[PDB]
Structures are given as structure tokens and as C-alpha cells.
Design a protein around this ligand. Structure first.
Ligand SMILES: CCCCCCC[C@@H](O)CC(=O)O[C@H]1[C@H](O)[C@@H](CO)O[C@H](OP(=O)(O)OP(=O)(O)OC[C@H]2O[C@@H](n3ccc(=O)[nH]c3=O)[C@H](O)[C@@H]2O)[C@@H]1NC(C)=O
Ligand SMILES: CCCCCCC[C@@H](O)CC(=O)O[C@H]1[C@H](O)[C@@H](CO)O[C@H](OP(=O)(O)OP(=O)(O)OC[C@H]2O[C@@H](n3ccc(=O)[nH]c3=O)[C@H](O)[C@@H]2O)[C@@H]1NC(C)=O
Lengths: 257, 256, 256
């Protein structure tokens, strides 16, 4: 079979047609799995959870477990995972809490490496890479294309901007703006992620605008509001700069300087 | 209650209402108390005593031998109390013959995914060890302390009651009670006022703790001096007494 | 010896006294040598060669494909020697065609829980990787090196023989032989005199190495100047020659 007979499938679970589930894995009550998704051996899936299409989940992962957050109380919170995602060895993904969104969400095309953690109520976009042991504490929003190097730690409620980059062992306590590169414990702003922008084919005009934007924010001594005003123009001209400006505007715990 | 795909050793002892999920191993000389819930894919090894109403999650290794190229299999122990939560992939090692010969965990502790509790460590009650917190060995964690994600604790260190580490802290020296530490290497920052409030500490006790911080950290005093200077406040406030005592017992220095 | 709940692919090759615990998978093209003990809940994938008298603990993934977006299904290898101990949850990945197409590990290595050995890394002999030590890829670790818990090693770096890293070190450049490093980012501190004594080095060799360290790290020389200055004691002392050679081979920077 596509479904190993040593696996355990709750009667209430709903598996699309070509789903593979390896030996000694558990697909629990109210778990929904979508077409082309391959579940490895030794995998614990718990619900209520919805996993889309063409995903890949490796051994020793715990996807859809209750958060150990002391506030959570057995409520029927959820987890939503999209399509084309890779979940590697021993990754842990917890479901949401009623105190927030009552949902934890992961989009599409994400690569989530071994022993990474995705805490309750987290929101991961698309095309993100979480390298080994990257941990998102809770209520963490990671926007499209971000890359978090191994053992990057993200404090609860922090937002990780689109196309951003973290060096290995970074400890992020504040919001990381879109395109920014951070390193260290505590994490510190270094520059922008030009390598990402290039691997992605951003235009030279956008890069140049991104580069001036950085200065306005980090190098000219403005308070954040002074900064946001000065970017109005370029944010009106360049969408890339608007994403940047927006990411700074939505910061609740401040920005990583 | 006890899944037939699990392997229960004949010398293992299970109290009533114990559950054991599939493909778990409850080895020789493991004793499990009443109400305890063990997940699937758990390895319990002994000699080990687990109390009541505990919950242990999948991929955990509880009661394993401390690593070594050597296969020295002494009868050292692990003792775990009641109402503890042990999450995914937690490693907990038994003690060493040279030392206490026992690793000890109290009650109402929360030990999050992939934390490690090294041989001969002692955890009290109401402690939280957030993800990937690692206790090297011979570590003593007193009541209500909180170690944030990826906190590393060097061997022989004492983590004081009600203390707090920020995420990714590397602790190489005793953390006095109530103290908050950050960084690698870890440094003292302030007192855990957030914790003290959540636990209903009196405003009087909190101000006295705040003042005691300065006596130890910001007035240039020696310790024999700080402690002499603390003696009176300690007598009035049992909370200050815990603090003073944590500092007095700091044999190989305090995190400054 | 081979538990009937384990899964052994027809193509695997196992030595006579190989033990395999329950719920382990020995996949296609895996070879296991005499006296090796595979625990329960182990995933082994190939092509992989495992030598003799090894110990692989539970929840380990040995011989998986690297998640490197560059790897594309090719049949790269992993070779592991003898007398190794691989603890709980260790991940070891096979090589890439972009490099050596092989991940390699020698003999007498102690690889502790949740450590990661990335694609194309090479490990020598008598090394100790403490809990959650992670080699990113294309890392070379030379004999007798000790990496303390949560040591991160950046891809392409070389860890020299008898070197030591403090816990939570983040290593981005090569670490010369014998050198001790600490912190994030990692920095050189002194020489692993423990290791030298522990390993029967003569007091004459030790003084020369101590002298060698001063030459490279304390006198304001350039690497080339420093290398030249060492030639003599390198000729006289093979221990020093290991030190000089590690610095020489430091293509892209030594840790300072
Ligand atoms: C990235 C590191 C490694 C990954 C760790 C992953 C952990 C999560 O899966 C689970 C988790 O820890 O949930 C917590 C939840 O994400 C948070 C917000 O909802 O709330 C809880 O943590 P905490 O109580 O610390 O959260 P707050 O954000 O409210 O804390 C306020 C601030 O005071 C600090 N604090 C907290 C307690 C204290 O005693 N002293 C403090 O200083 C704390 O650092 C924080 O900065 C929750 N804790 C508990 C035990 O319930
Ligand atoms: C140390 C503890 C952490 C655990 C790490 C273990 C992970 C590995 O098993 C898997 C892995 O990460 O493989 C990568 C492979 O080790 C590398 C070399 O071949 O190459 C690839 O990674 P990456 O492309 O990031 O590494 P490079 O060596 O090519 O990096 C180039 C430089 O660009 C930087 N960079 C990268 C991406 C970006 O968006 N912005 C950047 O600045 C990066 O920091 C680095 O300095 C591979 N990446 C991917 C996602 O495929």
C-alpha cells in the first residue's frame, strides 16, 4: 500500500488519494492530508490540522501537537500547512491558542530543517528557509523568502521581514525589517541581504533604492517616525521600499538596530 | 491503557491508570506512578522512579546512561516526582557513581522540547526549562526558576529560586535567586520582578529584593560584606534570606 | 539479534553479530560491520558503510540526504569507521557531487545527542562532539578535537587536531590544532594544555607549543612571518609541525 500497515490512521482522518504514510507513524483525529504528500516513518501528526499538497515530512517530527504554553487549555485550536513544503527530521510544529489567533499557519514552498521549532500562533509565509534548530517562540510572523540560519532564536511576537537574513546562532529579540541581515546574540543589524536580492533577480534600481532606505533608517539619526516620513517618497516609487517601510511601521517590539 | 505495541519489561512496575502509548519502551527497573501518561515512541530506561500524574512526550529518552565511549553500567538512578510535563525529545540521564549516583526532578516542572538534563542534576519544583535548555551535569535548579530557550548551563552551577535566563544564555557561574541573566557569557541584569508579581510577592518584599541587588552588585562591596549588610533585611524578609543564602552558598563565584 | 519488528532492506549487508533493535530501518545499500549495535527507532539510509563495534542510539537519522537545495538525488556516500558512539537524535547526512560525494567519520568518536554532521564533512579519530554540536557542511575535524555543547561550525571550516571549543561557540574560521576557542563569534584563548597532558605529550613538546602560540598570536607577526619563525621547532617537534601545518592549510583565515 501507499499507507504502510504499521501506521496508525484515525478513522476521522482524511487522506487524499496518493498520500504515502511510512511505518510506525500516527495520523491522528481531524488531520487532513492533501494529494501527493509523503509522510515518513516515525511521524506524529495530531489535529485539528490541515496539510496541503506535495508536502514532505520526515521522521521524528511532531506536527500539530498542543503548545506547552500554560494558557492553552485543550481548546480545539488549529494548524494549517500549505503546499510544497519540506519538513525535515524531528521538527516540532504546535497549534494555536484562543488567546491569539487559534491557528498556526505555514504557507507554501518552505524548507524547514532538522529540529526547528514553530511555536503556537506562528505565521510563516512562503519560500522561507528555517535552517537546523531555528526556533520561533510563539506569535512569530515570518514573511516570504526570509532565511534563518542554524540555531537562530526568535523571541515571541517578533516579525521577521520578507527577504531578510539571519546569521547562525542569532538571538532575535526585535523585529527584523524586510531585506535586513542580522547576526549575533543579541542580534544586530548589519546590512541588507544583497545576496538574496540577487538570487531572486531584483532589479538594480530597486537595490539602489533599498540601499538608500537603509541609511534613512539606520545611519542618519532619526527617530523611527522621522524615518518613515523620509521614506514616503521612495516607498511611493518603489514597491520594494514600501515593503521595507511597512515592515518598520508594523513593528511592535521595535526594530533590530 | 497500555498499548500492546509497547514493550514493558517484566521487572517494570506500573501503577493503576498508567497509560503507555505505542512503540514505547519501559525497561527493567522502571517504576511508574499513578495517572502518569507516557507517549508513543518514548524510551524509559532504569533504574528509575517516576511519580504520579506525569506526562512524557514522544521521542524522549528518560533514564539513559550518561554518554561515554565506555559502557560502564552502574546502578545509578533517576527520580522524578509528580505533575511534571516532559515534552518532545527531552533527554534525561541518570546519575554517576562518582557523584550523587542520582539525577533528581521534583514536582510541577515543565520541560520543553529537546531540553537536556545531565547526570547528577537536581531540579526542584515549579521550574520551567524552555526548548533546548541544556544542563551539563551536577546542575542544581531551585524552585520557580525559568530558563529561556537554548539556555546552556555549565557543570556544577546553581540556578537560584525564582531566577530567569534570557534566550540563548550561556551560564558559567551560579545565578543567585531572583536574578535575571542574559547573554553568552551570561551577565546579571536585574531581578525577576515579572516573576515576583505573577507569584504574589508583597510590594514590601519586592522593594527589599530590589535594594538587596544593589548591595551585592552595585556598591563595590566584598561578599563577606554584602552579606553582613544583608543580615538585617534577611531577618525581616524570608525572600531576602533566600537571596542572601544563594549568594553565601556560591562556592565558585556568582554571575555578575 | 535482529529484532523482528525492525525493517531490513534485502539489499543491506550485515555482519554476523550485528544487533538491530525494534522499529529500526536499515535501508537499501547500507552495510554494517561486525559487532555494531543499532538501537531501537534508528533510521539508516544509504549508500552507507558502517564499520565495527559502533553504537547508534535511538531517534538517529544516519545516512539521510542533505536538504541542501543543490543536492539532487545523486548517490553520494557516507563512511563510518569503528568504535564510534552515536547518541540520541543524531543526524548524519551523506555527501554531495559538488564536493567529495562522501561524508566520512573515522574511529573512536563520541557523538552526543542531537549533534549534526552535515554533508561532506570529514571527522578523524578520537573526537568528541558534545550535545547539539553542528557541523554545517564541508567541515573537517581533525583527531582528538573536542567541541563542547552547542558548538556551531560554519561550512568549509577546519577544526584542528587536539583543539577545544567552549560551549555555545560559533566558529567561522579555521581553528588551528591545540587551540582553545570560546564565544560568538569564537575567539582564540590559549592552548588545550589539558589535552596535551591527557595525551602523554612531553613537557618539552608542551613548552614548544606554548612558545608556538605566542609566535602566532602575541607578537604582532603576519601569518607568513609566523610560519617562517616556526620552521625550526616544527623540524625539531612533530607536535609543532601539526600546529604549523594547520595554520598553513588555513586557506581562509585562522580564528583569532
Ligand atoms: C526562541 C526560544 C526557543 C523556543 C521556545 C519555544 C517555546 C514555546 O513553544 C512555548 C512557550 O514558552 O510559551 C510562551 C508564550 O509564547 C508566551 C507568549 O504568549 O507566553 C509565555 O511565556 P512568557 O510567560 O514568558 O511570555 P510573555 O511574553 O508574556 O512574557 C513577558 C516578558 O517577561 C519576561 N519574563 C517572563 C517571565 C518571568 O518570570 N520573567 C520575565 O522576565 C519574558 O521574557 C517576556 O519578555 C509562554 N510560556 C509559558 C511557560 O507559558
Ligand atoms: C552550523 C549549525 C547549523 C546547521 C546547518 C546544517 C544544514 C545543512 O545540512 C543543509 C544546508 O544548509 O546546506 C547548505 C550548504 O551547507 C551550503 C554549502 O553548500 O550551501 C547552501 O547554503 P547557502 O547557499 O546558504 O550556503 P553558501 O555557502 O552557498 O552561502 C553563501 C553565503 O551567502 C550568505 N547568504 C545566503 C543566502 C542569502 O539569502 N543571503 C546570504 O547572505 C551565506 O551566509 C553565505 O555566507 C546549502 N543551503 C541550502 C539551503 O541549500
Amino acid at each position: 500500500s501507499l499507507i504502510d500497515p504499521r501506521a496508525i490512521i484515525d478513522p476521522s482522518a482524511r487522506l487524499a488519494a496518493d498520500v504515502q504514510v511510512g511505518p510506525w507513524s500516527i495520523v491522528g483525529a481531524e488531520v487532513e492530508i492533501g494529494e501527493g504528500t509523503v509522510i515518513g516513518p516515525h511521524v506524529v501528526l495530531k489535529g485539528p490540522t490541515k496539510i496541503g499538497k506535495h508536502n514532505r515530512i520526515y521522521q521524528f517530527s511532531s506536527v500539530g501537537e498542543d503548545t506547552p504554553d500554560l494558557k492553552y487549555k485543550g481548546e480545539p485550536t488549529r494548524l494549517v500547512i500549505g503546499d510544497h513544503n519540506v519538513i525535515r527530521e524531528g521538527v516540532t510544529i504546535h497549534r494555536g491558542t484562543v488567546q491569539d489567533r487559534a491557528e498556526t499557519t505555514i504557507g507554501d514552498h518552505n524548507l524547514i530543517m532538522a529540529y526547528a521549532h514553530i511555536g503556537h500562533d506562528s505565521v510563516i509565509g512562503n519560500h522561507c528557509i528555517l535552517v537546523n534548530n531555528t526556533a520561533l517562540a510563539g506569535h512569530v510572523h515570518v514573511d516570504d523568502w526570509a532565511i534563518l540560519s542554524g540555531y537562530t532564536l526568535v523571541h515571541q511576537y517578533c516579525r521577521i521581514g520578507a527577504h531578510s537574513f539571519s546569521g547562525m546562532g542569532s538571538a532575535i529579540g526585535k523585529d527584523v525589517p524586510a531585506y535586513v541581515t542580522v547576526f549575533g546574540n543579541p542580534a544586530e543589524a548589519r546590512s541588507m541581504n544583497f545576496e538574496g536580492m540577487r538570487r531572486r533577480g531584483f532589479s538594480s534600481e530597486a537595490i539602489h533604492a533599498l540601499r538608500r532606505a537603509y541609511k534613512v533608517v539606520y545611519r542618519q539619526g532619526h527617530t523611527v517616525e522621522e524615518a518613515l516620513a523620509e521614506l514616503a517618497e521612495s516607498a511611493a516609487q518603489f514597491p520594494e521600499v514600501a515593503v521595507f517601510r511597512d515592515s518598520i511601521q508594523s513593528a511592535t517590539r521595535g526594530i533590530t538596530r
